[PDB]
Each structure stands twice: as structure tokens, then as C-alpha cells.
Design a protein around this ligand. Structure first.
Ligand SMILES: O=C(O)CCCCCCCCCCCNc1ccc([N+](=O)[O-])c2nonc12
Ligand SMILES: O=C(O)CCCCCCCCCCCNc1ccc([N+](=O)[O-])c2nonc12
Length: 563
């Protein structure tokens, strides 16, 4: 047991050890140069082999925070992450974490042309892929390191199969702009999992987990789900605390376990558990929810009618609420996790109040009646925005929400709002196409992450106490806290693209609603319609920028005159 580097090296392999170590160095020291990290990665990788050969060799006994911190401390003074070294453990590693730059300073990543890129690769495949992990982990310091190993293998395959194609650009770019989209979503989706542990606790995270895993594996018993939750919570605690080697291994041992215990988990993991290691864990995560068992008793007899309701609750409070979550969640694949958790806390309060009572049954009898307005509230919201999407179209719909929510929160920065609206646009596409039954959990997967992305950015750049209240108040009732955000008060002041030529128009309107929030949907559409007539006329004159300058600062006091 003596060595922890060795236990990892043996388990993960030479190739993965090197990689996860590079991800971890880039995640802690984001501003530090590429060539310097590789130097250190190799230094510890060579050292780890030393310990595999002899576990009782010098400094092999040391923990990975003591080891990776020291190596990282070799130049780092860095700047605020300079004093992180003085701290001298467990303060040293704890420092590195709180100091992770979510909103980086780092220069914008500019895509060099196909032939240019295919010759940095091929020639030096090695440092090429090692640059990919370096640049991603830097700009995404909560990016699921084991997931990023799978992304590097998808990036290598898009290059070790496209640079050798008749049409190189048509091969590379549709897969390289897919891989780019898929990783931005994975960083956001994991940054929320982390926030759920850091800003809400182990119990909230574990509750989300019990709900979700119960929805996915309804055939599986309660003791089984509880095993997976316990293991899953371990992987993410480590992965979120920067123990990238430990969790990567624990995610591997869990993928393995699921595959050897399918009978007691699901039927839908057949091909998943035949796939290679990195694909395996990813497969199981994106797997389709299994069928809920045929027959099954009504929750009421076990959580309302039973005399032992307050007995089993006072005895084991968390187990009984876990069983409520498990039993409700598995019967409800149609409900979102967040929703199922509201019903669990709602129930928790009815028990906390009623089991103190002289007649608990006559007190908590009508509890499933508190649940109806809770379920109905989002059910109605989806088949509303879906009707509005089918009506207005992706662009117009986004503009409806952009205006609405800029009026509600002009404090939240313009690009956070434009990006928020553009994620909800995807709810209109991707989620409304689905039938009723699949739509609601589909909806939270873009909302949860976009409200949390907005929340996370609000730490580096705080502007409102009102927003900060929702970003903390509660995990689950975050969505209604933003929906019931009435507003604030009286403290308010040519071509080249098409998809982005829309954002240019969006960011403008967002700012326009920032300035004049009293403007009516009549006024705002009248200005944006006369905006369309500005670009249309000027992109067809034979004195191009002469029209943009003179006829542009012509509607400036025709919009400001429409006040
Ligand atoms: O799923 C993985 O992360 C990779 C593990 C390997 C695959 C195992 C099977 C799938 C388990 C799915 C459950 C994921 N747990 C989660 C907990 C808490 C929050 N939260 O926001 O509070 C989540 N948001 O999205 N997911 C969350
Ligand atoms: O699990 C749950 O019940 C919770 C999610 C249920 C799924 C609901 C899907 C309906 C369509 C919603 C689309 C419009 N809504 C919103 C836009 C913008 C912001 N913003 O703050 O910028 C919002 N905050 O709240 N709602 C927001």
C-alpha cells in the first residue's frame, strides 16, 4: 500500500497516468506554459515507475497532493497562486482549488487551417494530442478528466482518419466542430455536479443521484441504487477536488462493477459493457432509462397509509426519504430530477410537522395533494414554450426570452443572457421534438447547466444581490426563483456569417432592453424591424460603409426619439 503513485500507474496504465497528470497540472496551473508542464509530467511519470518496481523506495510513500503539489511548486511564485506554495499542506492543495480560474484570462483559441493542422499532427502526433489536453483543461478546470481522455481519443480519430481523406476539410471540420460543441456542454454539465457538492453539500448531490439512478434503473433494488450513489459520489468528490488519478480509477472500477452486476441494475447496458474502457463509462452515463417494473404497489400505502410511517421516519430519516426519492423517481421517468427532489423535500416537511402531532395520519393524509401544483407548474411550462417555439421559430423565440429576462435581470451581463437564451433555444429544438414523457428531464439538462453557468460567472463578476439570492437559496427551487424574479425596482439606467449575424442582432437588442426596460414589445419590434431595414438598405448601396455610418446614426435618435 505504501505508494499511491504506483497504485495509480499499475491501475490506469502509463498512457493514462501521463495524461490525467497533464490535465491536473493544467487545471491547477492554468496560466503556466505547455512545455513546462510536459517537463514535470515526465519527471513524475519516470518517478512513478521507480515506485512500481520498489514501493519502499525514497518518497514513494508520499501522498499525491504532497507529490503533485511539490512538482507544481517548482516555479509557480505565479501570482495569487504564488502564496499557494507557502501554505505547506493540506492548505497548499486547498489553495490551488479555490484559486481555479473558471473565467480565464487566457488568449482565445483560433482554429488554424486543415493542411496547417494536419502537419503539426502526423509529424508530431505526441505533443499534438498533448497540446489538446493542455488547452482544454486550462480553459475548463472542472472538465471531467476521465471524460477528457475519451475526448482526446475522439480527437485523435478525427485526425488519424481525416488527414488521409480525399476532402480533408469536409472530413475534419464537421467532427472537429462537433467535438468542440460536445466538450463545452460536458464542462458545464460537470461544473454543475461540482457546484452541487461545494455550494449545496454531499447530501443534495447524493439526493440528485438517488433520484436519477432510480429513474434510470427502476428494476434495480434500493440497496443497489444506494451502492452506485455511494461510488458515484466518491468519483465526483475526488474529480471535483482535483484527485484526477483516484476518480479516474474509481470510475473504471464502477463501469466494471455495473457490467458484472447488470442483472441487479439494467438490461440496457449490453453493448455499453462490450465497448473499450473510456467508451464504457461514457456509454453507461448517456444510457437510456430502463423500463419501470410491471405491476408495482402505490407509494401511498408505504408513505401515507402505513401506521409505521413516522416510526420508520424517526428511526432512519435519510434512509426513508431516500426510499421516498427512490420509489417516487422510479415510477416517474417523465419528471425532472429537480422536480422529484421538490416533492421529496415537500414530503420531508409534512413529516417533520405531522410526526410531532397527536394524529400524524389525519395531519399528513393530504400530502400527495401538495405535490400536484408542484408537478403541474413545469408540465405546463414545457407545453407552453414548445407551443411558442412551434409558433415563433428558434430565432424569434430566443428574442422573446432575451427581452423578457433582460427586463427581469439587467444586472446579469449581456453575453450571459445571449448564451442563456441560445441554450433554451435548444430546449425548443431538441426537447420539444420528443413526446411528452421524455421532454421535462430533457429540459432541466440545459436549464440546470445554463442557470448554474450564469450563477458561477456571477462569483467572478458579481452584480446583483437578487440573482445571488437564487444562486444560493436552493439547488432545486432555483428555476422558480429566476422565473419569479418579477424584476428589480427603480435602480436601472456586412455579412461573413448568418448564425452569428443573428447573435450580432441579439446582443444589440439585449443591450437595447438594458437601456430602456419600459419599451413595449411593439416599440422593441418596431426598432428591430427598422434595424433590419438599416442593414438591408446599406448591404445593397454602392457606397457600403457610407450608408452604415450616415443611415445608422439616423435611427439612433429615431429609437432614442421613440422614448
Ligand atoms: O454520470 C456520471 O457523471 C459519470 C459516472 C459514470 C456513469 C454512471 C451511471 C450514470 C449516473 C448518472 C448520475 C449522475 N449524477 C449526478 C449527481 C448530481 C447532479 N447534480 O447536479 O446535483 C447531477 N447532474 O447531472 N448528473 C448528476
Ligand atoms: O425541474 C424543474 O422543474 C425545473 C426545470 C423545468 C423545465 C422548464 C422548461 C420550460 C421552458 C423554459 C424556457 C424559458 N424559461 C427561462 C428562461 C430564462 C431564464 N433565465 O433566468 O434566464 C429562466 N429561469 O427560469 N426559467 C427560465
Amino acid at each position: 500500500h505504501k505508494s499511491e503513485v504506483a497504485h495509480r500507474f499499475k491501475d490506469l496504465g502509463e498512457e493514462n497516468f501521463k495524461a490525467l497528470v497533464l490535465i491536473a497540472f493544467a487545471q491547477y496551473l492554468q496560466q503556466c506554459p505547455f512545455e513546462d508542464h510536459v517537463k514535470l509530467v515526465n519527471e513524475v511519470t519516470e518517478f512513478a515507475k521507480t515506485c512500481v518496481a520498489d514501493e519502499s523506495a525514497e518518497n514513494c510513500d508520499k501522498s499525491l497532493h504532497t507529490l503533485f503539489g511539490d512538482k507544481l511548486c517548482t516555479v509557480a511564485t505565479y501570482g495569487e497562486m504564488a502564496d499557494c506554495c507557502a501554505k505547506q499542506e493540506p492548505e497548499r492543495n486547498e489553495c490551488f482549488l479555490q484559486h481555479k480560474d473558471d473565467n480565464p484570462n487566457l488568449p482565445r483559441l483560433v482554429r488554424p487551417e486543415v493542411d496547417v493542422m494536419c502537419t503539426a499532427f502526423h509529424d508530431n502526433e505526441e505533443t499534438f494530442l498533448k497540446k489538446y489536453l493542455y488547452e482544454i483543461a486550462r480553459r475548463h478546470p472542472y472538465f471531467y478528466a476521465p471524460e477528457l481522455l475519451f475526448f482526446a481519443k475522439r480527437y485523435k480519430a478525427a485526425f488519424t482518419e481525416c488527414c488521409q481523406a480525399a476532402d480533408k476539410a469536409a472530413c475534419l471540420l464537421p467532427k472537429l466542430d462537433e467535438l468542440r460543441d460536445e466538450g463545452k456542454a460536458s464542462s458545464a454539465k460537470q461544473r454543475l455536479k461540482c457546484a452541487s457538492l461545494q455550494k449545496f453539500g454531499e447530501r443534495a448531490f447524493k439526493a440528485w443521484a438517488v433520484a436519477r439512478l432510480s429513474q434510470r434503473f427502476p428494476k434495480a433494488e434500493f440497496a443497489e441504487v444506494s451502492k452506485l450513489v455511494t461510488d458515484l459520489t466518491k468519483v465526483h468528490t475526488e474529480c471535483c477536488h482535483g484527485d484526477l488519478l483516484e476518480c479516474a480509477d474509481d470510475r473504471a472500477d464502477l463501469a466494471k462493477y455495473i457490467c458484472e452486476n447488470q442483472d441487479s441494475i439494467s438490461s440496457k447496458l449490453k453493448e455499453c459493457c462490450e465497448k473499450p474502457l473510456l467508451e464504457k463509462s461514457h456509454c453507461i452515463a448517456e444510457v437510456e432509462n430502463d423500463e419501470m417494473p410491471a405491476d408495482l404497489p402505490s407509494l401511498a400505502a408505504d408513505f401515507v397509509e402505513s401506521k409505521d410511517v413516522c416510526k420508520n421516519y424517526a428511526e432512519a430519516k435519510d434512509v426513508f426519504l431516500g426510499m421516498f426519492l427512490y420509489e417516487y423517481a422510479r415510477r416517474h421517468p417523465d419528471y425532472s430530477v429537480v422536480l422529484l427532489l421538490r416533492l421529496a423535500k415537500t414530503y420531508e416537511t409534512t413529516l417533520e410537522k405531522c410526526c410531532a402531532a397527536a394524529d400524524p395520519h389525519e395531519c399528513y393524509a393530504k400530502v400527495f395533494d401538495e405535490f400536484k401544483p408542484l408537478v403541474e407548474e413545469p408540465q405546463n411550462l414545457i407545453k407552453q414554450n414548445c407551443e411558442l417555439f412551434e409558433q415563433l421559430g428558434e430565432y424569434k423565440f430566443q428574442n422573446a426570452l432575451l427581452v423578457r429576462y433582460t427586463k427581469k435581470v439587467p444586472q446579469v451581463s449581456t453575453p450571459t443572457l445571449v448564451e442563456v437564451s441560445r441554450n433554451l433555444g435548444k430546449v425548443g429544438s431538441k426537447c420539444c421534438k420528443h413526446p411528452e414523457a421524455k421532454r421535462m428531464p430533457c429540459a432541466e439538462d440545459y436549464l440546470s447547466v445554463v442557470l448554474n453557468q450564469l450563477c458561477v460567472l456571477h462569483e467572478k463578476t458579481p452584480v446583483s444581490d437578487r440573482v445571488t439570492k437564487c444562486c444560493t437559496e436552493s439547488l432545486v427551487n432555483r428555476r422558480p426563483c429566476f422565473s419569479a424574479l418579477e424584476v428589480d425596482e427603480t435602480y436601472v439606467p456586412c455579412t461573413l456569417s448568418e448564425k452569428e449575424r443573428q447573435i450580432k442582432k441579439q446582443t444589440a437588442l439585449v443591450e437595447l432592453v438594458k437601456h430602456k426596460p419600459k419599451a413595449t414589445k411593439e416599440q422593441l419590434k418596431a426598432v428591430m424591424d427598422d434595424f433590419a431595414a438599416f442593414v438591408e438598405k446599406c448591404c445593397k448601396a454602392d457606397d457600403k460603409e457610407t450608408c452604415f455610418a450616415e443611415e445608422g446614426k439616423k435611427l439612433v435618435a429615431a429609437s432614442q426619439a421613440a422614448l
